[PDB]
Amino acid sequence: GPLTGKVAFITGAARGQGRAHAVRLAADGADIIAVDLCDQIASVPYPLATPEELAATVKLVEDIGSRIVARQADVRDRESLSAALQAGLDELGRLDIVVANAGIAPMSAGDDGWHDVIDVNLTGVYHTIKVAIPTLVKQGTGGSIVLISSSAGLAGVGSADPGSVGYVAAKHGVVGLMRVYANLLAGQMIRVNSIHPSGVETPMINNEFTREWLGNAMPVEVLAPEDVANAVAWLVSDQARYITGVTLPVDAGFLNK
Amino acid sequence: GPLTGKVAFITGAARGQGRAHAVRLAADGADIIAVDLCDQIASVPYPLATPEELAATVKLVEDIGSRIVARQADVRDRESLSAALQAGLDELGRLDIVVANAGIAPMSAGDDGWHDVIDVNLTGVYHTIKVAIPTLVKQGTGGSIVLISSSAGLAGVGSADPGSVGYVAAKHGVVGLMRVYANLLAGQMIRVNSIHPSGVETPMINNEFTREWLGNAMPVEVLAPEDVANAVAWLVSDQARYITGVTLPVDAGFLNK
Amino acid sequence: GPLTGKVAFITGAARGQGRAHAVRLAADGADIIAVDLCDQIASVPYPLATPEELAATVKLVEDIGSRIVARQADVRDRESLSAALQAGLDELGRLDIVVANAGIAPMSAGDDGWHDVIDVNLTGVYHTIKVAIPTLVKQGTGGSIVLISSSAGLAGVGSADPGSVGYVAAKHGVVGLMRVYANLLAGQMIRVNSIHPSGVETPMINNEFTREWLAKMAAATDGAMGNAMPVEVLAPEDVANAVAWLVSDQARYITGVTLPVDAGFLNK
Amino acid sequence: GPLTGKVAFITGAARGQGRAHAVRLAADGADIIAVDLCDQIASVPYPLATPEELAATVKLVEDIGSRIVARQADVRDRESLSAALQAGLDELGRLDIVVANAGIAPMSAGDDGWHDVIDVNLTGVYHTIKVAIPTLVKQGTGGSIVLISSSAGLAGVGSADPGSVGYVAAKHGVVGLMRVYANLLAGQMIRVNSIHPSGVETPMINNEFTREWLAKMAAATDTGAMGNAMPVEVLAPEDVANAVAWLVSDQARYITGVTLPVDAGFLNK
Ligand SMILES: NC(=O)c1ccc[n+]([C@@H]2O[C@H](COP(=O)([O-])OP(=O)(O)OC[C@H]3O[C@@H](n4cnc5c(N)ncnc54)[C@H](O)[C@@H]3O)[C@@H](O)[C@H]2O)c1
Ligand SMILES: NC(=O)c1ccc[n+]([C@@H]2O[C@H](COP(=O)([O-])OP(=O)(O)OC[C@H]3O[C@@H](n4cnc5c(N)ncnc54)[C@H](O)[C@@H]3O)[C@@H](O)[C@H]2O)c1
Ligand SMILES: NC(=O)c1ccc[n+]([C@@H]2O[C@H](COP(=O)([O-])OP(=O)(O)OC[C@H]3O[C@@H](n4cnc5c(N)ncnc54)[C@H](O)[C@@H]3O)[C@@H](O)[C@H]2O)c1
Ligand SMILES: NC(=O)c1ccc[n+]([C@@H]2O[C@H](COP(=O)([O-])OP(=O)(O)OC[C@H]3O[C@@H](n4cnc5c(N)ncnc54)[C@H](O)[C@@H]3O)[C@@H](O)[C@H]2O)c1
Secondary structure, eight states: OTTTTOEEEEESTTSHHHHHHHHHHHHTTOEEEEEEOOSOOTTOSSOOOOHHHHHHHHHHHHHHTOOEEEEEOOTTOHHHHHHHHHHHHHHHOOOOEEEEOOOOOOOSSTHHHHHHHHIIIIIHHHHHHHHHHHHHHHHTSOEEEEEEOOGGGTSOOOOSSHHHHHHHHHHHHHHHHHHHHHHHHGGGTEEEEEEEESOBSSTTTSSHHHHHHOOOSSSOSSBOHHHHHHHHHHHTSGGGTTOOSOEEEESTTGGGO | OTTTTOEEEEESTTSHHHHHHHHHHHHTTOEEEEEEOOSOOTTOSSOOOOHHHHHHHHHHHHHHTOOEEEEEOOTTOHHHHHHHHHHHHHHHOOOOEEEEOOOOOOOSSTHHHHHHHHIIIIIHHHHHHHHHHHHHHHHOSOEEEEEEOOGGGTSOOOOSSHHHHHHHHHHHHHHHHHHHHHHHHGGGTEEEEEEEESOBSSTTTSSHHHHHHOOOSSSOSSBOHHHHHHHHHHHTSGGGTTOOSOEEEESTTGGGO | OTTTTOEEEEESTTSHHHHHHHHHHHHTTOEEEEEEOOSOOTTOSSOOOOHHHHHHHHHHHHHHTOOEEEEEOOTTOHHHHHHHHHHHHHHHOOOOEEEEOOOOOOOSSTHHHHHHHHIIIIIHHHHHHHHHHHHHHHHTSOEEEEEEOOGGGTSOOOOSSHHHHHHHHHHHHHHHHHHHHHHHHGGGTEEEEEEEESOBSSTTTSSHHHHHHHHHHHHHOOOTTSOSSSOSSBOHHHHHHHHHHHTSGGGTTOOSOEEEESTTTTTO | OTTTTOEEEEESTTSHHHHHHHHHHHHTTOEEEEEEOOSOOTTOOSOOOOHHHHHHHHHHHHHHTOOEEEEEOOTTOHHHHHHHHHHHHHHHOOOOEEEEOOOOOOOSSTHHHHHHHHIIIIIHHHHHHHHHHHHHHHHTSOEEEEEEOOGGGTSOOOOSSHHHHHHHHHHHHHHHHHHHHHHHHGGGTEEEEEEEESOBSSHHHHSHHHHHHHHHHHHHOOOOTTSOSSSOSSBOHHHHHHHHHHHTSGGGTTOOSOEEEESTTTTTO
16 A cells, blocks of 8 residues: 555544544555543543444454554653553554544533643644654654644634633644644654544544534535545655645535635 | 546646646546647746647547547637537536646736736636536536645745736635635535645746746755646545645645745 | 824725725825726626715815825726826825725626726736835835735635626735735835725625625525624724724834734634 | 723733733723733743832833732632732723733743643633633623734744744634634624734843744744844834734724734734
């Protein structure tokens, strides 16, 4: 495949879009370093991933034919995340692609929702970049860093809940991370871009809370996780070698409507 | 390939990026309706394409194994452009993809440069869209319209020459066409996006005038026409089925620098 | 006032927003060079200004106490526009502020609508900038160029009509003009910015016709056409007040900006 | 003046731009609720404001002829900030204008710089909005909320230092706060906008650490890419205060959801 011999580090890889990236990039030949919390955060009113789900991602990727290192780790904890990445490096010996995908959407928790969404969705993305840079720079072969933002990183879409205004703030902060790192790493031939999905059919929105709590331009209800994985697989390939500093909506026209 | 059975209408197909689109989309299985002015505009201080160059594109596409209908046509003349497209529809029977690529960069012609760049780069893009819509809508199978803008469509980069100011104004106007047509056509599952290259190695910039007249974030001097064609080939594929309303820089970080 | 001793050149000054700029900047002490077509363009489905309306602007500004030179001129015709500007310069002796406000919204005219809206709303703005630059540069005291775009200069809001997609294209092109001229002219301390109103109560939209089309746009969309704040329409004075700030010393270092004056429409 | 009978809550009011906002809005007739940390933060290598400076802002505003309630408060501590605002509400009886101006620029502190800059410049701005909303909504007379971002809120103007990356991320996050609150509050006629200065002449820009940062950033680029477009070395605090005074006035009654550069053309360059 176009990614044979490369290694992709993916946060939130136990299910949802993170699993879709693991499967898609492995299908294209990449080996995978997969991390997920595999535990609950109290301000999040829907279940986060289980250890069983991370093991399921591992089986899918192994069946495709790639090597995979999978660790439980929390993106909020730099030492934890660094240790997990280093386990992947010890086994696979290189790093080419980073997909900073782990995220949460807390609600109905008061300001705990603000703090937790900033911590996972902004600080955790910072940590994901920071733990990867020294390897990418030392290797001297360029690479790709893909940050997962949202429509809410470019538009004021949300409710008054602290976790929702925090989600908007965090996802906007992720665009800032993208833009500064695209500038800092361009000289190293490391591309940095952000992806902005509107709604995607995953357990972040397919849950009891969201149904009880509860439009794109194209007549598309919700995107598939594969739509997001397909965009990312293009971006990290040689077909997109000179694409950097871009905010890419994958959204059936939502941001332009 | 992924585009077998589809037809792509490409303006400015005689050379440069237009040729690169014709070759890349044909390699993916598409048949081609190729048009070019194949004549000079007096305000443009470098040579435009010749009839022989359009014939050379035809040979390349036929050698790849796709069908191609090529006509001389001026994007400024709606009737000319419509007749040319119709020659292609009469032989190939359908239309799926439109690449509004023809463009000029006049200089040193005073206000004739202003007029000519608006007429080719803005009015000509409107005509390219307008003549394609009836077929796409009557078919009812969706499609893709790709408008070629520039860094100068999103940033104030230019000199005081009326042809240069006009290039900025026209390429900005192309973004506006993209945004309104993406909204107008979303219901028909017709995606509309714009591409924003910075510099590309073609005879628009590789000529005697430009040498006499006298950077990106990544250490890349100029992009290849293939870089722009690679982006477009992805956009018009099912891998980008829900991408619409986007301004996509293909620019080694120029717009983010 | 804060603009005493300065001169403002305003296109489309016979009525509407252009008249509002003339009276607002005159109230702050500016003298005025006012131009308008004062004639109809066949693709435009509502009446353009009359000669009597331009004369009425002149009286309003004289009653305020400023000097004003007014001429019938077409922004599409650089020579017409330059002659009119020069009549104003001969009388007032300087130029400080340019407001490129003339514009049209053709509809239901076929491709004549495309060509006319590009010609007035984009080429006419270019002409307005180009006739003014030499004076501003020769004086060496800086100045302000204010281009009137629209929400449709930053968003794809329009209908399936050559005049409407042309309005979007033109108003987006006006942002381009702003951005490149802000860079070209910054070294001369000439500020260049664009203003983006949503709907403003003038004869351009205060007609049966526009309300028809708004109703169809509304029905065709899944309050999409409405502002974020509960404000039905902005006053011309809202746009004139923004411009009066921008061209003052209170905004001396504001350049290269797209400024929405829109009750939150673009952010909605 | 145009703001006679109005009350403006300003964070970081002890010196710099915050003092300039207090003086400028007072000159237009407003009464002021002024808060500042009046203390140091270890990751910030230059001095923050002193209690003396806050008392000097009080003197300036009283001399202009307005009433002012000033309190020491940390925007990172929602309860502290709420208590300070309440002290001003208890005395002045209303609120019309919020200027979320307090901010820091940590550097050479490792990841403590990341955490502190997010905490002050993003979380602190959230707290400033949150403590003001109930009063604004209960009054039912509209109002203005102005968030102070930066060029670095719209462009990736930063170095690799965690405090700098964090400054870019936080200032971008402020735009997000603006956009969502403009939508949430529009129905109440409460305008929300953000201001994006480039460089402004205050201790944040002229200390030796920032100076060395600016020199390093200039040397890293091949393009005077760190300068403004107009030949203006640095903006005055009054340039930012003048823009805010306009925005909160009836001359800008329908301006909301806008990112406003005040930057001598920097972002467009
Ligand atoms: N689902 C949507 O509609 C949608 C829309 C736009 C953007 N996004 C974003 O896409 C990303 C992927 O989310 P998803 O839709 O696949 O939802 P998801 O909840 O199915 O997946 C998120 C994953 O991240 C993990 N995770 C959460 N906190 C973590 C932490 N502290 N450390 C390590 N792992 C952590 C979860 O356990 C989970 O497996 C997120 O950044 C999210 O904000 C989602
Ligand atoms: N080359 C660059 O650096 C660069 C950078 C950004 C964007 N662009 C854009 O890329 C597009 C392709 O240009 P290119 O780089 O391949 O340059 P090019 O000059 O090699 O190709 C442009 C082609 O369009 C044709 N054309 C010009 N006017 C025409 C008309 N009135 N009707 C029909 N055909 C006409 C030419 O004859 C030519 O074959 C243009 O829209 C251009 O503005 C180029
Ligand atoms: N009214 C709105 O809702 C709205 C919203 C956003 C932007 N705009 C823009 O505001 C500007 C002012 O328009 P308005 O609302 O006051 O409408 P208006 O029709 O009342 O005023 C426009 C004026 O320009 C004149 N004019 C038109 N073409 C001309 C030409 N070729 N040369 C010289 N003068 C010409 C008219 O005769 C008229 O007096 C325009 O650029 C318009 O596109 C209007
Ligand atoms: N100076 C520039 O060039 C520049 C450029 C763009 C944006 N900004 C921003 O302008 C705003 C004002 O900064 P300034 O230039 O006046 O600098 P400054 O350092 O002179 O003023 C900042 C003030 O905020 C206070 N403050 C800091 N942390 C606090 C906290 N936790 N709680 C309460 N008060 C706190 C300080 O003590 C001080 O009085 C900041 O948001 C800053 O990021 C500054």
